[PDB]
Design a protein around this ligand. Sequence first.
Ligand code: HEM
Length: 146
Amino acid sequence: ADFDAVLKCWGPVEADYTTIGGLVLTRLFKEHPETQKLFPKFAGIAQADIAGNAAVSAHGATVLKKLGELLKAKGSHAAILKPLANSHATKHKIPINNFKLISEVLVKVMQEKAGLDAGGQTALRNVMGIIIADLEANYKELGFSG
Ligand code: HEM
């Protein structure tokens, strides 16, 4: 049910993955500034320059596309999620808590741009909890617990 609740508000996200993707990464770097250094291509860019940055928005679109794939899969997602865990743990070297930060940013952005009301916000936190628990199990398989 919680996947359905998120998907009934995903339209504005999927309608402009670049714009919304930019909103999400811009807000992530503002509200959680320590996350920006985890993106060496973006680290060091002054906050005022991030909202208008096409590379940041293009990356945000990649992120939200991938999340849309997971959401549309409704909890049967191993072929999508395992590679995502593998690359984030081992290539990007992103400790798991950072996913919790981006999820909360997404909740905020969807409340403002996608009509995601209080119940939908609960649902999205639950769904992101499912995804993050699966990422974290995979991280642990690979030796990553930090
Ligand atoms: C569920 C949330 C997220 C999704 C769906 C997601 C998805 C992606 C995808 C699809 C890519 C490109 C393919 C790949 O390298 O795996 C990527 C790259 C990356 N992600 Fe994420 N990501 C998420 C969260 C995060 C977080 C929270 C961080 C750090 C705070 C992060 C840091 C990176 C970095 C550093 C890259 C490589 C960028 C580059 O070198 O071009 N990701 N992510």
